[PDB]
Each structure stands twice: as structure tokens, then as C-alpha cells.
Amino acid sequence: SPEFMENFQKVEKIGEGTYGVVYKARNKLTGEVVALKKIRLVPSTAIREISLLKELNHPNIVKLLDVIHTENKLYLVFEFLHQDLKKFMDASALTGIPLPLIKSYLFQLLQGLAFCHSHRVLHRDLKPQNLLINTEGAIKLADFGLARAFGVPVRTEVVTLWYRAPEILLGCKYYSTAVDIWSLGCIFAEMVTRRALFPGDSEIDQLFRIFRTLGTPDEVVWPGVTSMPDYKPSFPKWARQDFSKVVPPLDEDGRSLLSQMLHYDPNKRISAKAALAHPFFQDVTKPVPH
Numbered sequence: 672s673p674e675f676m677e678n679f680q681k682v683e684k685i686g687e688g689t690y691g692v693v694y695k696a697r698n699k700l701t702g703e704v705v706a707l708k709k710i711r712l713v714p715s716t717a718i719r720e721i722s723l724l725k726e727l728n729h730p731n732i733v734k735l736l737d738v739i740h741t742e743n744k745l746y747l748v749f750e751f752l753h754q755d756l757k758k759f760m761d762a763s764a765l766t767g768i769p770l771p772l773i774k775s776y777l778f779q780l781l782q783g784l785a786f787c788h789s790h791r792v793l794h795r796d797l798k799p800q801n802l803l804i805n806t807e808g809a810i811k812l813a814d815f816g817l818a819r820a821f822g823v824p825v826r827t828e829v830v831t832l833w834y835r836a837p838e839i840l841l842g843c844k845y846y847s848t849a850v851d852i853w854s855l856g857c858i859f860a861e862m863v864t865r866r867a868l869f870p871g872d873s874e875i876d877q878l879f880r881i882f883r884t885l886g887t888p889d890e891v892v893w894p895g896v897t898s899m900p901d902y903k904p905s906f907p908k909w910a911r912q913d914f915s916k917v918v919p920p921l922d923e924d925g926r927s928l929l930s931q932m933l934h935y936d937p938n939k940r941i942s943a944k945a946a947l948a949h950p951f952f953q954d955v956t957k958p959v960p961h
């Protein structure tokens with residue numbers, strides 16, 4: 672103490688992220704491998720949200736070990752992890768992730784989200800590449816979306832659209848913790864089917880792909896939807912599709928949970944805390960990935 676960037680030896684780039692390149696590095700003093708994020712350099716609400724995220728200590732949130740300030744630079748020192756759910760799904764495309772691991776990962780992500788949400792922290796940008804996994808079966812939240820959400824002046828892609836809740840796409844100013852449950856519901860479906868649920872290429876295309884699968888919402892399904900800032904009565908009217916077609920492998924317990932996570936109305940969408948008690952998790956275990 673203090674640590675300096677000279678105390679770290681770069682090993683390899685371990686991928687990109689909302690802040691560009693992440694590096695595997697080695698502490699020359701201790702031998703510990705870590706993951707380093709470089710942030711090139713803030714609104715008052717943004718400082719406060721960063722402080723809230725720094726407060727969080729949880730098994731399912733990637734552990735921040737240190738923050739090193741040098742001139743224009745911030746170097747975030749994290750625990751070393753180097754697999755993520757997107758890379759794991761791609762390597763498992765031939766066979767699919769086994770259901771006990773799907774259940775375990777979904778359960779843990781709900782635990783991490785429940786913890787964030789009770790501390791007034793939202794993720795806002797949940798996607799499979801932001802979800803880090805280790806050898807012992809844990810999965811962890813990372814690359815929180817607060818820089819673009821709170822106008823942080825830091826350098827920071829259609830993949831982000833695929834997991835965006837419909838109340839965001841329709842312009843809602845004061846969205847809620849429910850946006851994270853939507854994203855996780857999409858990831859749940861994607862683990863099961865081995866394909867992204869709503870891979871749109873623009874905000875309107877994302878909306879139309881959602882509508883084509885879940886039905887065009889109306890006031891009966893989603894009170895207030897037709898007055899949302901970007902709602903247009905010219906939207907096409909699609910009927911809802913059966914989950915036997917949308918997520919063929921799921922049974923009624925899985926379809927029940929997924930339908931509650933993808934509820935149009937954010938006020939009716941299941942909370943993270945409540946989803947942990949869903950019957951789907953009756954037999955949840957902690958398997959190790961291969």
C-alpha cells in the first residue's frame with residue numbers, strides 16, 4: 672500500500688467491456704493475478720451511484736480490490752476471472768448448458784440482483800458477456816451500466832438492445848429495478864434455447880421483435896402503455912406466441928417463472944427477491960462448469 676501500476680505485470684488481454692480492454696495482470700509483489708480495467712477520465716448523482724456500487728460486497732458481484740489513480744487514468748483492480756456466460760454458452764452450443772447449471776446461475780444472479788436492488792443499485796446493462804464465472808460454479812455481476820445512465824464523462828453496439836426492457840424502449844423517464852429482471856428473463860431464455868431471444872438492430876426493431884413474440888401490449892395487459900412517450904398507435908398488432916414454441920425445452924415451472932420475468936407491466940413483473948421463492952428453484956444445486 673499504495674499499489675502502483677508499475678507493481679503489475681500485464682499478462683494478456685482477457686477481452687473487452689463497456690470500458691474497452693480488460694487485462695489479466697500479475698502483482699509483482701504478491702504473485703496474485705488480477706483483472707485490470709483502465710478508465711480514461713463527473714455529475715453529483717454519478718459520484719453518489721459509484722459510491723453506492725463500491726459499497727456492495729456480495730458473492731455474486733465481481734470483487735473490486737483496489738482503485739489506482741494516475742493523472743488522467745483510473746485503474747480498477749478486480750479479482751481475476753476470465754470466463755463469462757457468453758463465452759460459456761458459445762462453447763456449449765453443441766450440447767447446451769445443463770439445466771442444473773442454468774438453474775444455479777439464474778438463482779445466483781437473482782441473489783446478486785436482489786442485493787443490489789435492496790441497496791438502491793440497478794445494473795441497467797445485464798447481458799451474458801457481463802456475467803463472469805469461476806471454476807467453482809459461481810457467477811457474478813459486472814460491467815454495471817451507470818456511466819451511460821448517469822452521463823459520466825468517460826469513454827464507453829446493438830447487443831445492448833437485445834436485453835433492454837420495453838418501458839425503456841418506449842421512453843419511460845423513471846424506470847425501476849424491474850428493468851434488470853427483464854434482462855435476466857431474456858438471458859434465462861437464451862441459456863435454455865441457445866439463442867438470443869430478441870436480437871434486434873434498432874430501438875424500433877427491438878420493440879417489434881418483442882411484440883411479435885409476447886404480443887403487442889394494450890391497456891388491458893399494460894395499463895398506461897398507450898400514453899408512454901414513444902408509444903405510437905401505428906404499431907402493428909401481433910398476437911402472443913406460446914412458450915412451447917418460444918422456449919421449447921421449458922416445462923410449466925420454467926414457463927411460469929419466465930412469464931413473470933417478461934411481464935410487460937413493470938409493476939407486475941416479478942421481483943428478484945420473489946423469484947428466488949419460485950417453485951422452479953426447488954431442486955437448485957451448485958454444480959461446477961466444464
Ligand SMILES: O=S(=O)(O)c1cccc2cccc(Nc3ccc(Cl)cc3)c12
Nearest residue numbers: 710712713721722725738740745747823
Ligand atoms: O471514486 S473512485 O473510487 O475514485 C471510482 C471508482 C470506480 C470507478 C470510478 C469511475 C469514475 C470516477 C471515479 N471516482 C473518482 C473520484 C475522484 C477523482 Cl479525482 C477521480 C475519479 C471512480
Ligand SMILES: O=S(=O)(O)c1cccc2cccc(Nc3ccc(Cl)cc3)c12
Nearest residue numbers: 710724725733735813814815818823825
Ligand atoms: O466495472 S464494474 O464491473 O462495472 C464494477 C464492478 C463491481 C464493483 C464496482 C465498483 C465501482 C465501480 C465499478 N465500475 C465502474 C467503472 C467505471 C465507471 Cl465510470 C463507473 C463504474 C464496479
